[PDB]
RNA sequence: AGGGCUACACACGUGCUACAAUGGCGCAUACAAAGAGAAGCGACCUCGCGAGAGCAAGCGGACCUCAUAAAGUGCGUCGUAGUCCGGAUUGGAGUCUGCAACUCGACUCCAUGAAGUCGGAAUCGCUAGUAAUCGUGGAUCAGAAUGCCACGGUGAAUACGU
RNA sequence: CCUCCUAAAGAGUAACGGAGGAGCACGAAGGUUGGCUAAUCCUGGUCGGACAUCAGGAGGUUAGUGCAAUGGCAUAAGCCA
């Protein structure tokens, strides 16, 4: 909860005045990181799936949820069932600890990262940016992996607006781009 | 060791092995080692760890893989999205250096298309 | 490309473009000295570089200087 | 004046260079012939990584310059890998020629490092200092040779027979 | 043999009337207990594009139902164990 405390400390108040909030029980709280990584493919290999899973199982201290299809009406293929991903949301402590893991060592462990999207947000006020490629960060070994990786990440905050979404993260150490 | 990145040149002489870097060549390696106080007949693999951390430090001066190819394309793009003969040649896949298309071009262009 | 030290151009364009630079922008430039280099004073100027049949319009842009007007006009018609 | 003869899905002839260890690369080092040259060949010295530049002697030639032969040989390395093989391609930056290097010049530095592991049917040259291989010079020409003409180094195999 | 209309708001009704299906399938696709709920669009997300997986918002039985059609189904018969 390292960064978690920071929220209650530096954050919250920063927003309480900047956003001029009336109740501490309003300040846009951080509502679990999601993580997905729609590996897909499978068919060709099928093993790369559990690979993309084991990879996530490392990126995160929890257990990957190898998701399935749904519509089946997919040109690519897919038939109702059939593996195709591994969301794996974040759990409170592990969540913030993760929010710490990255932004402090992940985003830092770049490839050429010269700023971060300031519009990866939504309408409600939630951000979700793709890493483009797993930076090999604290995962099961480094030079010991497989054909690339990459994945997606979403924050999702109680922010009533994308604007308020900016305040959050901004109060933290979100590198962003400006 | 990853050194510049990933690339694990080992079981070879410092020089050549060092050239393995997507951005350094024979000339750069034969000079970088000395500048880093490193020989050449030395097998980077069995090389003293500490002596490896030196290479990285000095090799960081020269541009490699990442920022290399990155900019290397930018240039092309420029003259490309400019309208100059050079660019035109690229989009067309023809020899920009100005060779002969009537014959010999399998390199710049595809092989056969009879 | 290489030409040692000293950007070269033909008087024609110089006398014309120079007067243009000061007299502001206006009609294009009728010139055949395509072998001439592009200078910053020609930036945003109206130039009509001839190739073999007629002249062609061009706009001197930043990254468009250390070159020659000629390379901005395809000489041969292909397909 | 500028462009074109340097166009391009393509096909054919003649070649140059590779596929490597009878080799690549580093260092040291031995032997040659034949030529060219006062809008020329241009040393020595200095600067530049280098192409080259500055200054500037000599020679109109068995006197001077182009000009440092390459193989080879000694030591060392690489240990067979698409590789320290092979260099196309392209990018960045330059040198010189010439009014003038876009189309279209030759070369240098750094980087990049493709095809290619000896090539189907078919087909070519060569009987000895020949073939094979290695370098060297000249004509043309301001400046664009793997072409042409010429020079010497090393140096085979095979011919029953028609 | 099953479904809808014909069929005049009970049942039932004819034509060489207008339209489709059945001759099976499941040891689970049966039983019960426990839990879940869509289609579709918008927006924002590595490779993810018309169309996979992810996040939200709108939406509300327009989804789904082993196979026709009608009626039914959220207390779900629909879905998972
Ligand atoms: Mg011709
Ligand atoms: Mg001569
Ligand atoms: Mg000559
Ligand atoms: Mg009735
Ligand atoms: Mg989308």
From Swiss-Prot, chain A:
Gene Ontology molecular function: any one: 5S rRNA binding
Residue numbers bearing the N6-acetyllysine modification: 2
InterPro entries the record matches: Ribosomal_uL5, Ribosomal_uL5_bac-type, Ribosomal_uL5_C, Ribosomal_uL5_CS, Ribosomal_uL5_dom_sf, Ribosomal_uL5_N
UniProt-listed GO biological process terms: cytoplasmic translation; ribosomal large subunit assembly; translation
Superkingdom per UniProt: Bacteria
Keyword annotations of the record: Acetylation, Ribonucleoprotein, Ribosomal protein, RNA-binding, rRNA-binding, tRNA-binding
Family statement drawn from the similarity comment of this UniProt entry: Belongs to the universal ribosomal protein uL5 family.
Subunit structure: Part of the 50S ribosomal subunit; part of the 5S rRNA/L5/L18/L25 subcomplex. Contacts the 5S rRNA; cross-links to the P site tRNA. Forms a bridge to the 30S subunit in the 70S ribosome, contacting protein S13 and S19.
Note: Identified as a multicopy suppressor of the slow growth phenotype of an rsgA (yjeQ) deletion mutant.
Function: This is one of the proteins that bind and probably mediate the attachment of the 5S RNA into the large ribosomal subunit, where it forms part of the central protuberance. Its 5S rRNA binding is significantly enhanced in the presence of L18.
Listed name of the protein: Large ribosomal subunit protein uL5
Phylogenetic placement of the source organism: Bacteria, Pseudomonadati, Pseudomonadota, Gammaproteobacteria, Enterobacterales
Encoding gene, per UniProt annotation: rplE
Swiss-Prot record, chain B:
MF annotations from Gene Ontology: rRNA binding; structural constituent of ribosome; tRNA binding
GO cellular component, one term: cytoplasm
Pfam families the record matches: Ribosomal_S13
Effect seen on changing residue 104 to K: In PW097; partially suppresses a rimM deletion
Assembly behavior: Part of the 30S ribosomal subunit. Forms a loose heterodimer with protein S19. Cross-links to the P site tRNA and weakly to the A site tRNA. Forms two bridges to the 50S subunit in the 70S ribosome, contacting the 16S rRNA and proteins S19 and L5.
The protein's name: Small ribosomal subunit protein uS13
GO biological process terms, semicolon-separated: cytoplasmic translation
UniProt family annotation: Belongs to the universal ribosomal protein uS13 family.
Keyword field: Ribonucleoprotein, Ribosomal protein, RNA-binding, rRNA-binding, tRNA-binding
Lineage: Bacteria, Pseudomonadati, Pseudomonadota, Gammaproteobacteria, Enterobacterales
UniProtKB/Swiss-Prot annotation, chain C:
GO biological process entries: cytoplasmic translation; ribosomal small subunit assembly
SUPFAM superfamilies from the UniProt entry: Ribosomal protein S19
An example Gene Ontology CC term for this record: cytosol
GO molecular function terms noted in the UniProt entry: rRNA binding; structural constituent of ribosome; tRNA binding
Domain of life: Bacteria
Keyword rRNA-binding: yes
InterPro entries xrefs: Ribosomal_uS19, Ribosomal_uS19_bac-type, Ribosomal_uS19_CS, Ribosomal_uS19_SF
Function: In the E.coli 70S ribosome in the initiation state it has been modeled to contact the 23S rRNA of the 50S subunit forming part of bridge B1a; this bridge is broken in the model with bound EF-G. The 23S rRNA contact site in bridge B1a is modeled to differ in different ribosomal states, contacting alternately S13 or S19. In the 3.5 angstroms resolved ribosome structures the contacts between L5, S13 and S19 bridge B1b are different, confirming the dynamic nature of this interaction. Bridge B1a is not visible in the crystallized ribosomes due to 23S rRNA disorder. Protein S19 forms a complex with S13 that binds strongly to the 16S ribosomal RNA. Contacts the A site tRNA.
Cited NCBIfam families: rpsS_bact (TIGR01050)
Descriptive protein name: Small ribosomal subunit protein uS19
Native source species: Escherichia coli (strain K12)
Primary gene name: rpsS
